[PDB]
Design an enzyme around this catalytic site. Structure first.
Site, short mmCIF file in Angstrom:
data_model
loop_
_atom_site.label_atom_id
_atom_site.label_comp_id
_atom_site.label_asym_id
_atom_site.label_seq_id
_atom_site.Cartn_x
_atom_site.Cartn_y
_atom_site.Cartn_z
N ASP A 270 -66.66 15.32 -79.26
CA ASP A 270 -66.69 14.22 -80.22
C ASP A 270 -68.08 14.05 -80.83
OD1 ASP A 270 -64.01 13.08 -80.42
OD2 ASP A 270 -65.00 11.12 -80.55
N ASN B 153 -71.28 8.77 -83.54
CA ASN B 153 -71.50 8.62 -82.11
C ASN B 153 -72.96 8.88 -81.71
OD1 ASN B 153 -68.78 8.12 -82.01
ND2 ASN B 153 -68.23 10.07 -81.03
N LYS C 91 -70.44 13.68 -83.45
CA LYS C 91 -70.51 13.36 -84.87
C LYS C 91 -71.57 12.29 -85.07
CE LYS C 91 -66.33 10.54 -84.27
NZ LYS C 91 -64.93 10.34 -84.74
N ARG D 113 -51.90 14.55 -72.88
CA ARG D 113 -51.43 15.82 -73.43
C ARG D 113 -49.92 15.87 -73.21
NH1 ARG D 113 -54.41 20.96 -72.17
NH2 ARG D 113 -54.33 20.60 -69.90
N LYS E 65 -65.74 -1.07 -71.96
CA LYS E 65 -64.39 -0.52 -72.05
C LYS E 65 -63.48 -1.27 -71.10
CE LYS E 65 -65.02 4.23 -73.55
NZ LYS E 65 -64.84 5.65 -73.17
N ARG F 292 -46.35 22.49 -81.80
CA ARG F 292 -46.75 23.88 -81.96
C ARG F 292 -46.41 24.64 -80.69
NH1 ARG F 292 -51.03 24.65 -85.59
NH2 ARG F 292 -51.70 22.77 -86.72
N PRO F 293 -46.06 25.92 -80.81
CA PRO F 293 -45.82 26.73 -79.61
C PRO F 293 -47.10 27.34 -79.06
CG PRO F 293 -45.23 28.00 -81.54
CD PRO F 293 -45.71 26.66 -82.05
N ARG F 294 -47.37 27.12 -77.78
CA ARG F 294 -48.58 27.61 -77.13
C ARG F 294 -48.24 28.20 -75.77
NH1 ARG F 294 -49.77 27.45 -81.51
NH2 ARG F 294 -51.52 26.37 -82.54
C1 LIG Z 1 -57.28 10.55 -82.56
C2 LIG Z 1 -57.90 9.62 -81.50
C3 LIG Z 1 -57.80 10.32 -80.14
O1 LIG Z 1 -57.05 9.89 -79.27
N1 LIG Z 1 -58.60 11.39 -80.02
C4 LIG Z 1 -58.56 12.12 -78.90
C5 LIG Z 1 -57.41 12.83 -78.62
C6 LIG Z 1 -57.38 13.61 -77.48
C7 LIG Z 1 -58.44 13.67 -76.68
N2 LIG Z 1 -58.62 14.35 -75.55
C8 LIG Z 1 -59.85 14.10 -75.14
O2 LIG Z 1 -60.32 14.58 -74.11
N3 LIG Z 1 -60.45 13.26 -75.98
C9 LIG Z 1 -61.85 12.70 -75.90
C10 LIG Z 1 -62.25 12.32 -74.47
C11 LIG Z 1 -63.67 11.78 -74.44
N4 LIG Z 1 -64.62 12.77 -74.97
C12 LIG Z 1 -65.95 12.15 -74.98
C13 LIG Z 1 -66.66 12.22 -73.77
C14 LIG Z 1 -66.85 13.43 -73.10
C15 LIG Z 1 -67.58 13.46 -71.91
C16 LIG Z 1 -68.14 12.31 -71.37
C17 LIG Z 1 -68.88 12.35 -70.17
N5 LIG Z 1 -68.35 12.97 -69.09
C18 LIG Z 1 -69.01 13.04 -67.91
C19 LIG Z 1 -68.52 13.66 -66.76
C20 LIG Z 1 -67.16 13.97 -66.72
C21 LIG Z 1 -66.37 13.36 -65.75
C22 LIG Z 1 -65.01 13.65 -65.65
C23 LIG Z 1 -64.44 14.57 -66.52
O3 LIG Z 1 -63.11 14.86 -66.42
C24 LIG Z 1 -65.22 15.19 -67.48
C25 LIG Z 1 -66.58 14.90 -67.57
C26 LIG Z 1 -70.28 12.49 -67.78
O4 LIG Z 1 -70.89 12.55 -66.71
N6 LIG Z 1 -70.86 11.86 -68.86
C27 LIG Z 1 -70.17 11.78 -70.07
C28 LIG Z 1 -70.87 11.13 -71.09
C29 LIG Z 1 -71.29 9.82 -70.88
C30 LIG Z 1 -71.99 9.14 -71.87
C31 LIG Z 1 -72.29 9.78 -73.07
C32 LIG Z 1 -71.88 11.09 -73.27
C33 LIG Z 1 -71.17 11.77 -72.28
C34 LIG Z 1 -67.95 11.11 -72.05
C35 LIG Z 1 -67.23 11.07 -73.24
C36 LIG Z 1 -64.24 13.05 -76.36
C37 LIG Z 1 -62.86 13.68 -76.45
C38 LIG Z 1 -59.57 13.00 -76.95
C39 LIG Z 1 -59.65 12.23 -78.04
#
Ligand SMILES: CCC(=O)Nc1ccc2[nH]c(=O)n(C3CCN(Cc4ccc(-c5nc(Cc6ccc(O)cc6)c(=O)[nH]c5-c5ccccc5)cc4)CC3)c2c1
Length: 382
Positions: free
Chosen positions: A220, A225, A222, A80, A141, A21-23
């Site tokens: 995320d 989770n 849902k 990304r 993990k 997609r263009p962004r």
């Molecule tokens: C199709 C399959 C797939 O591939 N899907 C996909 C594709 C592209 C994606 N792109 C993304 O980002 N996701 C995901 C990346 C992960 N999240 C979940 C997520 C978000 C924030 C955190 C998180 N965070 C910081 C602090 C923190 C530190 C550093 C930072 O940079 C940001 C926050 C913190 O203290 N407790 C938590 C935390 C710990 C335990 C429970 C809950 C929150 C932990 C998890 C969901 C989106 C993607 C997923």
């Protein structure tokens, strides 16, 4: 002191819908790299978009003149991938990103017992383990080290241990033993409005922490989770792994519309996810459903949500506001963020300091004796 470094058009691969997609993207002094569907007329910085402590890679697959920003955010590796028309544009795009990135600059595996594989991803796997000495249950993990502190809240799964090996990086996280929430909702079909208020209130509490203290969108939220601990309080999990999708990625029925269109998103995404979660708890069904993903996308994007007559007026006002399709119009999309939901009539009478301090009584006590009880790990899990 915060200003754009480089801006222009890129071809972005959709994160959940693997289509180009263009962004229009902006690279700022603070390190934020945000793409817009149209040129921005011109909010606090979100860590999701920052290029700080990310690595850049140029490649010619899947399509030429592609560059990938690879970041480790908390315990998840995210990518990304972008594409320009010429290699020159890529080189001056990558250097600027590299400029801002540089400009802004005893536990072992044998101590645990492998139990069950929870998930595989591109860069590693998640596994249910048991610490031998204590008998407690943890998710680990295990990330490939070639590809590459805890902050606690009551309702977030704690990162307990962090260690690495020669080629692996391991994150040990608390695993709740009160059961998956989809399991409790399925057995009980529907949750009472008071039961969903307890569950929703704790989620709102944890979402405020991530938005204000952590400046990150969870993205995320849902039912899969959400788990309960030994007492019945909510734990929002962090067991995700970035997977390359099946011939599209993930289950799109939960995605906020701004994410589905690969548009600009903010903290309002989690409130949409909150709307989807609480809609299913109080109604017993998902708001949007159809087997065709073309129709499901159109459903989430176009069809307004319908409510059963069983819901009260306070509930309908909350779900409608949380599931507004415009994030600027959405409940929680303003500057007050979580305060808009906390001040909503559905959460009247809820003292919010009590929620953080776990003073509210769990309406459902899971049938577990202790933190080591494995009832919801046994084959009664049906
Ligand atoms: C199709 C399959 C797939 O591939 N899907 C996909 C594709 C592209 C994606 N792109 C993304 O980002 N996701 C995901 C990346 C992960 N999240 C979940 C997520 C978000 C924030 C955190 C998180 N965070 C910081 C602090 C923190 C530190 C550093 C930072 O940079 C940001 C926050 C913190 O203290 N407790 C938590 C935390 C710990 C335990 C429970 C809950 C929150 C932990 C998890 C969901 C989106 C993607 C997923």
């Amino acid at each position: 002191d915060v200003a754009i470094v480089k801006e222009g058009w890129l071809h972005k691969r959709g994160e959940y819908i693997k289509t180009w997609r263009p962004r229009y993207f902006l690279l700022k002094n603070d390190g934020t790299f945000i793409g817009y569907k149209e040129r921005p007329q011109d909010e606090a910085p979100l860590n999701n978009f920052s290029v700080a402590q990310c690595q850049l890679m140029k490649t010619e697959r899947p399509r030429p003149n592609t560059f990938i920003i690879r970041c480790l955010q908390w315990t998840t590796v995210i990518e990304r991938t972008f594409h320009v028309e010429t290699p020159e544009e890529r080189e001056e795009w990558t250097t600027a990103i590299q400029t801002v990135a540089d400009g802004l600059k005893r536990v072992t595996m044998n101590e645990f017992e492998y139990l069950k594989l929870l998930g595989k991803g591109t860069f590693g796997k998640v596994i249910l383990v048991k610490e031998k000495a204590t008998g407690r249950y943890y998710a680990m993990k295990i990330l490939k080290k070639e590809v590459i502190q805890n902050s606690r809240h009551p309702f977030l799964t704690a990162l307990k241990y962090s260690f690495q090996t020669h080629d692996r990086l391991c994150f040990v996280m608390e695993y709740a033993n009160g059961g998956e929430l989809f399991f409790h909702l399925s057995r009980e079909r529907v949750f009472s409005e008071d039961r969903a208020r307890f569950y929703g209130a704790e989620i709102v509490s944890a979402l405020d922490y991530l938005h204000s203290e952590k400046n990150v969108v969870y993205r995320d939220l849902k039912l899969e989770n959400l788990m309960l601990d030994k007492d019945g309080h909510i734990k929002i999990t962090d067991f995700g792994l970035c997977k390359e999708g099946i011939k599209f990625c993930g289950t799109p029925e939960y995605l906020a519309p701004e994410v589905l269109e690969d548009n600009d998103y903010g903290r309002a995404v989690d409130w949409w996810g909150l709307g989807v979660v609480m809609y299913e708890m109080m109604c017993g069904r998902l708001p949007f459903y159809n087997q065709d993903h073309e129709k499901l996308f159109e459903l989430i994007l176009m069809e307004e949500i319908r409510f059963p007559r069983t819901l009260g007026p306070e509930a309908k006002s909350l779900l409608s506001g949380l599931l507004k399709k415009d994030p600027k119009q959405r409940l929680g999309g303003g500057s007050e963020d979580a305060k808009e939901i906390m001040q909503h009539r559905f959460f009247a009478g809820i003292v919010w300091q009590h929620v953080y301090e776990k003073k509210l009584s769990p309406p459902f006590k899971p049938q577990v004796t202790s933190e080591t009880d494995t009832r919801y790990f046994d084959e009664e899990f049906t």
